[PDB]
Structure formats: C-alpha cells, structure tokens
C-alpha cells in the first residue's frame, strides 16, 4: 500500500509534522501493515500517546490515538512534615510534572520512589497513593494521598571490637539520640543515616587523638527489625592499640620557613598520639604559609605508625607554592552599596603576597559591618601564573530604614506627636542617620544625630549631634516644672586598634528652667548648686549653659554588626565638664554586649548585657539629677512601666507652684496634703548598676527562611538605681537610696521579628520582685 493521507487525530501537545517524523509512514511513502504497527509503537515510543490505533482507510492511514499530555495539576494531600516540592522533585526526578505526559502506568513506580523516599527520609511507616483525576481535553489531576504514619526512630547501638571505652558514653559523644529522660528532658531522638555516617567519624576522630592509629571500624549493620521503627545497630571496630606520638619528620617545600615550621611541629616524643593535633598542625602551617604568600600549601602528613614499640612517626610532605598570589580583588553585591564602602573594608592588598588572615579580617570588618546579610567571596586563582588570584567578594547586603512607635493623643485633637527615624547610613551612603524628637502641647523635643562614619581615612566618624527640648510639661502652663534644654555635641571616631575605636568630642548644652517641683533633693541639688530657693513653692526659674567634654571608646571582637553570635563589644562612654561650664561635675558609664554561645554552632547564645554608670560632682557643684539613671519598663531591664527603678522625689510641704491644677498634679501643694510626701516616680540615682541575662533560642515551628531573621530570647532582668549621696539622716522616715541592695527581678522572653523596616521586638516580662515606685507593664511592645 501507499498512504494518501494520515488522519492525524489526537495530539494534545505535539506538532503533527514532528509526529509525522515519529511515524515511519509519511504521506506518500510506501505502506505495509508492519510499518503500520511500527507507526503504532513509535507513537507509543513518543511517550505521549496513551492509545495508538494506526488504522487505514484502504491505503490512506487513519491514526486513532489517546493522549498522555499535559497533566493539568498535581495535588498533594497528607504531606504534613514533608515539603510538596521535594516530593515533586521525585516527579522531576521521574521526569513528570504539571504539563507533562501522564502515563497511567507510571503511578506505582514513582509511588514506590515516594515510599523509597519515605524509606530514605527516616521512615518506612509512611505510604502514598497517587490518584488520577481527568481534566479537560486530555488533561489530568494527579491527586496524591500521603498515608504518613511515623518515622523510624533510633533505639539502640551495639558496639563490638571496642575494648577501652563504654558504648553508652560513646553514644553520648555522638548525636545518635535515643533518649529523652523523665528527669532530664532534651531534644528528640529520631533517625537519620547521615547521623550514623557522621558519628562514625566522631568515632573515627575519637580513637584517633587517643593514640589508637591502627584503630579501624570493621563494619556496622543497622537492624532491619520488623516493626518499621526498631533501629538497633551492630558496630564492628578494631580498637587499634594506642600509639605514642614519637616523632615528626616533616620536610618538603619548606621555603626557608623551616624554623617557623618547627615551632608548629613542637610535639612531645612518646606522648599519646593526637591525629587531630596533626590535623590542626597541618592547618597551622597552611596558616603559616597562608600568611607568607603560599596560597596552596600542600601539606601531606604520613604517620609511620610504629607498632613495634607502639608508637607513630609523622612524616609530613610540604609543598608551599608561590608567594605573590594576591594579584587583585573583585567585589559583588554593591548594586545598592558604595564600592568605596566595600573597598575601604579590606586589609589584604592587591599586588601583594597572600596574607590570608587579612582577607578574613577583611571579611571580619564585613562581619562587623552589620549592613550585610551574607559575608562571602570568590577567591579565584586567575589561570596562568601562581601570582594571579582575583578574589571576587560577592556578598549579600542588608536593608535600611527604621521608625519609632507611639504617636499622639487622638487624631486631630491638637497636633501632638512623638517621632524617631533612622535611615541607616542613609541607605549605606556613608551618612549615618539617627533622627528623633517630639512636638506636643506640653513639651517639644527636637534632636538630630548625623555621622559620616568614615568621613576621612582614619575611620573618621563625623558625628554631629544637636538637640532642642522646649520641655514644659504643661499641666496648665510653664508654672509646673518647665525645663527648656538645648545644645549640641560633635563627636569623632579614632584609629585605636583594628577592633578598637575611641569616641571623643565636646558637648554644648544650655538649659532654661522655670518653677520646678518641691522635691527636696532637687532643692538639695540646688543647694549643692549654691542656689538658695523657696522650697514650699515651685517659683524658682533657672538658666544654665553647661559646657561638657564627652568621651568614650568601642571594642569590637563580637561576631556581627547586626546579628552576632559570638564575642564581645566593649562600649566606653561618659562626660566631664570644663572650665567655662556653668556646673562642674562628671559622669562615667559603660554597657556591654557579650555573647556566650551555648551551642558551638552558636545557635544558643547566653547574652552578657549589663549596664554600668556613675556620675558625681567634680567639687562644689554636683551632677544634675536629670543626668541620673533610670530603669524598668525601659532598656533591657523592663516588664515594668517606663523608668520605674530609682530614688524618689520627696516633695516639700508646698504652697504655690504659681498654679496648682486644682486637685490635679498635686505636689503637697495649696490643694491639700501639705506635708513631706515621697514620690512614686523613680527620679533615679547617681550610680547605675543593672543588667539582663538573655539566652538566644530558635523556635522549631518557624520556616528558617525567616526564623534566622528572628531572635527569640528569654531573659532575667534585675538591678537597681540608687544615689551614693543619699543621706537618710534626712530620709529618716524614708527608705535609703545609697543602697545597692534595692535589686529587682523581672523575667520573660524577647521576640525579635525582622520586619522590612528593621527588626521589631515585643516582649512579656513579669517582675516578681518590686520596690518603691516599680510601676508595671508586663507586656512590652517596642521597635
């Protein structure tokens, strides 16, 4: 026969002419009925033709086909713990997807591989069921039922061939967990084969640094115990007869650094053998040669394990390489950032040999940046000579912008607002932005704090800071305790170490006061100011323009500038006055940021966060008590209401504040209570000693694309503020605040949520230890 035309039915994805290429018959090519059957199988061999009926109308072919193509959907049901996509990856492993050709034969073999995934993932007690639901014009839904019972769990380890270490404590060295005790509750205990392979190498490292160097794990076999959960496992090892580290016989391309090698090969001949030390000492050479230029310091040890005297002899073969590998360096991730911000943050220089650590230190200033999300690079040896390494610092940057919460009473009830905004190096342009202030109908505050942190090459931190408080606290008018206060401070950063930088500058401050409270310690401070006011009246106005020298210093060997895990950063701070100031005093303070990682993966970190401060007069005049310290409901001692830890304002039996608000804002005033009354408002002491003890924790219920953006942290808050000059001869019927044992206690958990405008912290903290005027707000919702 010969075909006049082929009746191309049933395509659903495939072109006709491409299918005509799949047909051995082509529209005028000679037809036999075997080639008709060859036309049957080849459309079956196309993998899209669920039925093929190549028939003919006498001699002209008439092909009747049913179509495998597009799977219109694949729906997953019962994948509680397992991701849809990794299950769908098995479909992508088996070459099927939404839009692919559905062979209805291909259900169970992939379903096997799904249960073979369930096999490999840690179970076998989990089965699947792919359900076909036909969709329009040939299409299909792949409904997928998942019958997930439970994973298999680690039950027992049997170790044989071990003769010097107990099996259970060896498991304690391992992560092969099979216990959460009843008077010891820890994390869970399921199975993974990756735990087994690694904790083999925990054991491989275990006997290694003991001295056992003919130690060898003979085999191991995990029980295929017929219950779908039973994980018992034989471990067959050879103990391997501890060897004495008897000598190192390093040579090779020592490059004249052989003495420097020899301090790195200081061993005790005959001490028990430590291959981890060998593992360490090889890297030290590779750090020794890595700082000498040798970027490829091939170091091949050979422990000649001499069992004849139960020792081991360390041959070490050294190939150092070339020196001037650092040709140049490249940078990526700068598409919003400044290149000079990046280029100023390096220490290993182009056109040099390799000092490998300056790269890492150059990575560490990038670690201490905090305007990044990843610190990484690409140290590409450019091909050709071994002097061409071009190090491509691809990194991931971070975000910017932050806003202060809390604004206004009402919405159009008198324009009052509280503000604060920080544009975070002005989007990383080298212009550090801190801006705040508030305008209200009772007080008005303005502040700027701007810095070019690297205005010049010395880390020159052009920190200009101004403020202006039109503070009245208008109860009816300025008669009730006004202090207008305004002034400025320019402060700089200084080259101190490569992890240290100083803070120094001069602070201007002019204050303007009117008719303040009958607090006698205020009067006492006024008497220490040589001012002799009326005590039963808020009638005393004051203008003072102090001139202070501020100072400070930063230490920096803590992990990250934004999300650290390990190290510490010491933050010296403080001020003194000058000749020319209207008041002569000092104040010193320092608060710490210390990270004690419980995990050595540093996923649990004890936080050392304390606060220290002290201020007093230089002689004659004293420190103003607005320069005192306050705590509770505040910086990290909180769970109280704001600034509710400290001494109190004992009011004079008072007559005239130039208006009492007439049974409002009563100050032992003309409106009653004309007696000495201790306040409840913590007006703070001249010494600060408070702290909080916080603990970095993850939460195992959050997706780790943004759980890593989150610091959940319990805490305990404690401490007091109290005044060293408090003389309770006058406070005889009152408490003493020259007492450091006014120590509170609050505790709770802090919740850092990284919002797109920076992190957002909210917390609940119950103080179970309170004193005078420790007013409380346990829920704390902050920025």
């Amino acid at each position: 026969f010969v075909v006049k035309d082929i009746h191309f039915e049933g395509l659903q994805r495939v072109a006709v002419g491409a299918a005509l290429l799949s047909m051995p018959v082509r529209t005028g090519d000679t037809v036999n009925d075997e080639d008709i059957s060859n036309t049957i199988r080849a459309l079956f061999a196309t993998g899209n033709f669920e039925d093929v009926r190549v028939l003919r109308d006498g001699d002209t072919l008439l092909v009747q086909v049913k179509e495998r193509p597009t799977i219109a959907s694949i729906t997953f049901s019962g994948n509680k713990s397992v991701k849809d996509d990794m299950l769908k990856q098995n479909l992508e492993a088996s070459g099927v997807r939404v839009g692919e050709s559905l062979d209805r034969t291909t259900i169970a073999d992939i379903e096997k591989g799904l249960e073979d995934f369930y096999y490999s993932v840690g179970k076998y007690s989990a089965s699947v069921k792919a359900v076909v639901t036909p969709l329009p014009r040939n299409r299909v839904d792949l409904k997928l039922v998942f019958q997930e019972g439970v994973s298999a769990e680690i039950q027992q380890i049997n170790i044989v061939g071990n003769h010097a270490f107990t099996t259970d404590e060896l498991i304690s060295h391992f992560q092969l967990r099979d216990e959460v005790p009843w008077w010891n509750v820890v994390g869970d205990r399921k199975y993974q084969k990756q735990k087994l392979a690694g904790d083999l190498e925990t054991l491989r490292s275990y006997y290694l640094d003991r001295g056992y160097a003919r130690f060898n794990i003979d085999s191991t076999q995990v029980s295929l115990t017929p219950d779908k959960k039973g994980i018992y496992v034989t471990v067959n090892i050879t103990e391997g007869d501890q060897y004495k580290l008897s000598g190192v016989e390093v040579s090779g391309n020592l490059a004249g650094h052989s003495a420097e090698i020899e301090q790195l090969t200081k061993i005790e001949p005959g001490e028990l053998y430590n291959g981890t030390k060998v593992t360490k000492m090889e890297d030290d050479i590779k750090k020794l040669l890595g700082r000498y230029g040798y970027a490829y310091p091939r170091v091949q040890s050979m422990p000649e394990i001499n069992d004849a005297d139960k020792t081991v002899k360390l041959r070490v073969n050294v190939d150092a390489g070339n020196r001037f590998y650092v040709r140049k360096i490249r940078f990526e991730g700068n598409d919003t950032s400044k290149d000079a911000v990046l280029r100023r943050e390096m220490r290993q220089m182009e056109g040099a040999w390799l000092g490998s650590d300056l790269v890492d230190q150059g990575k560490e200033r990038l670690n201490r940046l905090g305007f990044f999300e990843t610190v990484d690079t690409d140290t590409q040896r450019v091909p050709g000579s071994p002097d061409q390494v071009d190090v491509v610092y691809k990194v991931k940057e971070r975000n910017t912008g932050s806003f202060n919460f809390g604004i206004g009473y009402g919405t159009e009830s008198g324009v009052s607002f509280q503000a604060g905004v920080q544009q975070d190096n002005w989007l990383g342009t080298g212009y550090a932005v801190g801006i705040n202030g508030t305008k209200n109908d009772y007080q008005t505050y303005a502040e700027l704090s701007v810095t070019n942190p690297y205005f010049t090459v010395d880390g020159v931190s052009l920190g200009g800071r101004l403020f202006y408080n039109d503070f009245q606290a208008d109860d009816a008018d300025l008669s009730d305790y006004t202090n207008k206060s305004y002034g400025t401070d320019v402060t700089l950063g200084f080259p101190i170490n490569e992890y240290n930088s100083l803070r120094a500058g001069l602070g201007y401050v002019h204050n303007s006061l009117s008719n303040m409270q009958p607090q006698v310690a205020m009067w006492r401070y006024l008497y220490s100011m040589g001012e002799h006011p009326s005590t039963s009246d808020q009638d005393n106005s004051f203008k003072t323009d102090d001139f202070t020298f501020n100072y400070g210093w930063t230490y920096n060997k803590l992990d990250r500038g934004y999300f650290p895990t390990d190290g510490s950063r010491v933050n010296l701070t403080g001020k003194v006055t000058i000749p020319g100031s209207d008041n002569e005093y000092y104040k010193v303070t320092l608060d710490t940021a210390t990270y004690v990682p419980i995990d050595d993966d540093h996923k649990w970190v004890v936080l050392g966060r304390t606060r220290w401060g002290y201020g007093d007069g230089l002689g004659g005049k004293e420190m103003p008590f607005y320069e005192n310290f306050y705590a509770g409901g505040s910086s990290t001692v909180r769970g109280f209401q704001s600034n509710t830890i400290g001494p109190k304002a004992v009011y004079f039996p008072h007559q005239a504040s130039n208006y009492d608000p007439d049974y409002d804002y009563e100050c032992a005033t003309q409106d009653g209570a004309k007696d000495l009354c201790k306040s409840d408002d913590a007006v703070g002491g001249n010494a600060m000693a408070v702290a909080s003890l916080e603990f970095i924790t993850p939460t195992p219920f959050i997706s780790d694309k943004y759980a890593n953006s989150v610091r959940t942290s319990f805490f305990w808050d404690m401490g007091t503020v109290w005044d060293t000059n408090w003389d309770s001869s006058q406070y005889s019927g009152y408490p003493d605040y020259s007492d450091p044992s006014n120590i509170r206690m609050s505790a709770g958990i802090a919740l850092q949520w990284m919002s797109p405008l920076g992190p957002l912290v909210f917390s609940y903290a119950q103080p179970f230890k309170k004193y005078d005027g420790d007013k409380a707000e346990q829920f704390q919702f902050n920025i």
């Binding site: 070339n322 020196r323 001037f324 056109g351 040099a352 000092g355 000579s385 071994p386 002097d387 080259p495």
Partner: protein, 87 residues
Amino acid sequence: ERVVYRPDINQGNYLTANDVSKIRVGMTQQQVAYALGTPLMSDPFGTNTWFYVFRQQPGHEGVTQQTLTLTFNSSGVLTNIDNKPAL
C-alpha cells in the same frame, strides 16, 4: 598630624635577596618567569620592564619601600636589573 596609631599600609610584588642573585642580565622573561613568575606590573607600551617593587608604611614611623624594575629587550631577554631602596 599628632596621630600615632596609624594602621599599617603594606604591599608586595617584590623580591628578596636570593631572588636578585637567582637571576642575571640576559635572562629571558620566561627565565625570570620560571624562578620568579610574573611581576604584578609590567611595561604596557614601552619595552618590557618587570616591576617587583616593595611598599610599606609603618604607623607614624615613615614609609618602607624596595623598588626593583627589570627591563628586558623586545626579545624579552634581560637588559636591566634596577635595584632601588625607599624614598
């Protein structure tokens, strides 16, 4: 000015004293390139001069430099061994 803690500037692409004695005038570029490799600067339009120049700054303590340039001919064969100390 009165700053003393000035973090130190360093630079390589230079040679040590054995490297000066390791080579001699008449060597090819390749003869240098086996023993010393490339310099990290050569002559881009003039005749090939192989620039192995040390640089360093000690903090508020001056500057440190060993200048050494190596002019070859057009055949890349050594014609000059310039050695020069710091400024």
